[PDB]
């Protein structure tokens, strides 16, 4: 294992989406889905996404140069057809679109049509905050978690991300999968061969087990009333599917082979709001300044620590800034041989 | 014990709300959200609640006459000032003016100044559903809840309430507090002398405990997954509070006495959006039946049952419109005494 710069790694991502054949705009937007879950220390969504995508679109399922265009929209709303683009590049537009009308409606809602996986939801919700906008995302998957006492996959990891502006300091921001935990874990432990924690998966029969051998399926957030996350997992669905017309969860086509060609159709969906559209920017910026000042110092257990949406992140973000991402032995070997195939320098190590 | 009939009551609450010297349609507003509750069996937030409301009306922390205002607002949005009026009735109203934005820019977003408690979140959520819209609801409260590894009460228990339009049957329906489970089932289990459930109540170091006697503050939804739902009640708190320019949780005064004449200040929140707007509501609602048909249709645990958010509470409603709501015998007592200090006819039972 061995440390890579945020730049070496970013230079290096975009050089291969564009040997493959991939959009300018494809190639950067992501590029920068990656960089941020690399970053921010959610590296389940970070690098070692690049190979998954090279594979997708070499495929055909995900389109090299897709053409968004907006199928239809009135007021501050408006449905995008993003040509079976790549998640990132795809609600990357979507949120641009969603703050353009947000700047003059006060507010923007984006349905997102024919899209992909986008890696971390807080990539785009993120986005709007660092504008000055409060950003919402959503999107759903192929299914994997239950319903509160099911006894079946029923929705995907459905993720939430809201982004929060901040004042002179990095942005509030809630990255979360509605199941307590996300998939790539219980993949994890099962290499590890450990026990998962308790209540964060179940068996084909709907009981809980902490085998990762056993596992069959996720559970909602919120364990005994798991159907508080799973209600959750049913919103983003609504504003991922039923409103923007793609299919749901469980009609989803898997996220993983051995089809890489037949286009999966994902929709998601993107929300703007403009702070000095309800009020004094000034008093919310206050307010927030308060709201964290206050949160930080508030008590905490024995030997823990209390922390906002984010403060996670911009911890190990920062650690990233100047020491440097960790890449494992196996990743950088994919990388050594996708440098190879596509004639690009792989990232320089430390 | 005995049961009432859902007009009875209802007649009963708005008649008393008017002998106090209520505006009419305070009186409509304060007594659809408690009808709102006792008909979807979420009787905390019910006609029980009828005792405290004339409390704080005549102490003056609850305006008779309110004024509701506009301060300002561009586009599809808009900050009202409920000049203290009844939670119901500012938070009514505000609906009202999200769908009326709604129809005209596709979404409709509200921020709520001055008002107050305004009892079930889905009565405002379930009223955009019933008009078609898909409606939000966010408001805080004084602090009950600590963040994850907290050790003090921070945020309130912030609900969420999302409506979304069904088809051929009742809208789908979700209201729930961002705690593992609200206040008022601690009051409810010391009064058994029961322990609760584990996971839902800390000590004063932070620490769960079963004893409703011990508790302190109430847990984030999420268990050792509760930085979720604290991450959750964040951003109802950021649209309650932070884009209201009212008063944080922590910032709050309580909710109960001895001051039932100095008003709270209590901000919220109100979203619409229009499903028409982002596309053909024929296929809305097919995907929206399909959704449901295939949810409740899904497989259960062992003698366990699945349902969507809403589904259990159209269960009771529906049982209560033939039945009627079940009266405790110290509820129905209030009742006579309120009817006796007003001079109007106490809930005819059975
Ligand atoms: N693209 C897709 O289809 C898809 C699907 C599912 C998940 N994802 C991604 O998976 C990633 C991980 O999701 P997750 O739910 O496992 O993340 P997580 O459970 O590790 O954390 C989510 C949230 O809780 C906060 N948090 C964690 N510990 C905390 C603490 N001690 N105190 C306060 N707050 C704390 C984090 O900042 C974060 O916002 C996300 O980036 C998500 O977007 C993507
Ligand atoms: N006015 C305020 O300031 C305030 C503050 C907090 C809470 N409240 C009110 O408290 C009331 C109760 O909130 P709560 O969170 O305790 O309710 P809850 O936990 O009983 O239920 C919340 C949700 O989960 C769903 N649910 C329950 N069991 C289920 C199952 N088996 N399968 C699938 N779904 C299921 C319910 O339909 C509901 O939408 C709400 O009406 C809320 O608005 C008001």
Known sequence: ????????????????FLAVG????????????????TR???????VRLLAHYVTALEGGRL?????????????????????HAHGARATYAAMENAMALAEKFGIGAVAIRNSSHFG???????????????????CNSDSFVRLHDGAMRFHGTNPIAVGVPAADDMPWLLDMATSAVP???????????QQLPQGVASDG?????????????????????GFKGAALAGVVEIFSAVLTGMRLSFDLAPMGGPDFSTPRGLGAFVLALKPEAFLERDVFDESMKRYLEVLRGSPAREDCKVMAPGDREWAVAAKREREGAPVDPVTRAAFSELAEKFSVSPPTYH
């Open 1 to 16: 294992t061995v440390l890579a710069r945020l730049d070496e790694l970013e230079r290096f991502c975009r050089a291969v």
């Open 22 to 37: 991939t959009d300018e705009e494809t190639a950067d937007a992501a590029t920068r889905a990656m960089m941020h879950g």
């Open 40 to 46: 921010l220390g959610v590296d389940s969504h970070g």
């Open 63 to 83: 389109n090299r140069r897709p053409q968004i265009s907006r199928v239809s929209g009135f007021g501050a709303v408006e449905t995008i057809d993003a040509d």
């Open 120 to 138: 971390p939801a807080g990539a785009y919700a993120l986005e709007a905050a660092r504008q000055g906008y409060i950003g919402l995302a959503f």
């Open 183 to 193: 998939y790539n874990r219980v993949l994890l432990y099962r290499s590890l061969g």
């Open 205 to 225: 029969d709907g009981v809980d087990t902490r085998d990762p051998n056993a596992v069959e399926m996720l559970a909602p957030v919120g364990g005994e009333f």
